[PDB]
Enzyme design. Structure first.
Site, mmCIF file in Angstrom:
data_model
loop_
_atom_site.group_PDB
_atom_site.id
_atom_site.type_symbol
_atom_site.label_atom_id
_atom_site.label_comp_id
_atom_site.label_asym_id
_atom_site.label_seq_id
_atom_site.Cartn_x
_atom_site.Cartn_y
_atom_site.Cartn_z
ATOM 1 C CG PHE A 89 -1.899 1.041 1.330
ATOM 2 C CD1 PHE A 89 -3.158 0.907 0.733
ATOM 3 C CD2 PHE A 89 -1.657 2.173 2.086
ATOM 4 C CE1 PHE A 89 -4.090 1.886 0.857
ATOM 5 C CE2 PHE A 89 -2.614 3.136 2.234
ATOM 6 C CZ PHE A 89 -3.845 2.972 1.604
ATOM 7 C CG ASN A 186 -4.519 3.880 7.084
ATOM 8 O OD1 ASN A 186 -5.723 3.820 7.144
ATOM 9 N ND2 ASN A 186 -3.857 4.120 5.938
ATOM 10 N N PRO A 187 -5.878 0.891 9.121
ATOM 11 C CG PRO A 187 -7.823 0.193 10.246
ATOM 12 C CD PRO A 187 -6.848 1.410 10.072
#
Length: 271
Positions: A89, A186-187
């Site tokens: 990510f 920050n899932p």
């Protein structure tokens, strides 16, 4: 052969993928010629035939919707350069504000021990270590996130205060759980249905989706861990406040710069 007409013809191919096509071509050009954004301002020239095809190859790639920072190999976050790659990510600017809130709670309370769940590139935990005295314990399900969070910690000289282990939630750091004073994440918080299967996804789907709800991560976290004595600060979705209140009551929610609800904050630190 002349570099500026290349820049101009490439910029048009990226029209439907970005608002800033000239900039992205400038960054791609620099990335391929191995030169600096800043030194592209030579008024005539600079490009070889292998170099030409390469740029057009990466420009066609980008035109498909493939992430620019995968092509660049890097993403700027909190003024630091994090390496990124296909499989990780790419850190978002919104998350910066979680780090600034975290640092401010560290300053206020004298916190020494922090966790970063779902660390990805290392963006949160590395920044937190770089800009405080805290030690950070970080996890991720992905082997590629772990390897890269490690190299980013090394890159910013905090390998002695940032430690990453492969696994879910805080399972790999069970023995440290009691000493951890603040848990950050920050899932993945996106609904499974916000993805139409016709549309391409270039980032790993474990980094984005929290089941049908978009809330799986928070449900399992807050069902599995006792947070007495701890502070929990986590990025959330836009429309998720009311449903989160049903998972963890007692929480406060915080608005970002843009005026919307983006973070949850559960402060159970004693006097």
């Amino acid at each position: 052969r002349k570099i500026w007409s290349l820049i101009r013809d490439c910029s048009g191919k990226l029209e439907g993928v970005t608002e800033t096509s000239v900039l992205e071509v400038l960054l791609i050009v620099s990335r391929v010629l191995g030169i600096r954004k800043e030194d592209l301002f030579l008024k005539d020239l600079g490009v070889s035939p292998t170099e030409e095809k390469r740029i057009l190859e990466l420009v066609e790639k980008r035109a498909s919707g493939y992430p620019l920072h995968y092509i660049l190999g890097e993403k700027e976050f909190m003024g630091l350069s994090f390496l990124v790659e296909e499989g990780v990510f790419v850190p978002r600017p919104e998350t910066e504000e979680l780090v600034e809130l975290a640092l401010e709670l560290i300053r206020k309370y004298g916190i020494k021990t922090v966790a970063d769940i779902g660390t990805g590139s290392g963006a949160i935990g590395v920044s937190v270590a770089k800009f405080s005295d805290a030690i950070v314990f970080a996890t991720d399900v992905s082997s590629k996130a772990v390897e890269i969070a490690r190299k980013n910690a090394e890159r910013h000289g905090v390998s002695d205060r940032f430690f990453v282990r492969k696994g879910e939630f805080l399972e790999p750091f069970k023995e440290k759980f009691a000493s951890i004073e603040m848990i950050l994440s920050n899932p993945p918080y996106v609904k499974s249905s916000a993805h139409l299967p016709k549309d391409v996804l270039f980032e790993p789907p474990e980094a984005l989706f929290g089941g049908e709800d978009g809330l799986d991560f928070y449900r399992e976290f807050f069902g599995r861990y006792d947070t007495s004595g701890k502070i929990v600060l986590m990025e959330i979705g836009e429309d998720q406040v009311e449903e989160l209140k049903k998972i963890v009551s007692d929480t406060v929610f915080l608005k970002d710069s843009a005026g919307k609800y983006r973070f949850l904050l559960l402060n159970r630190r004693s006097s």
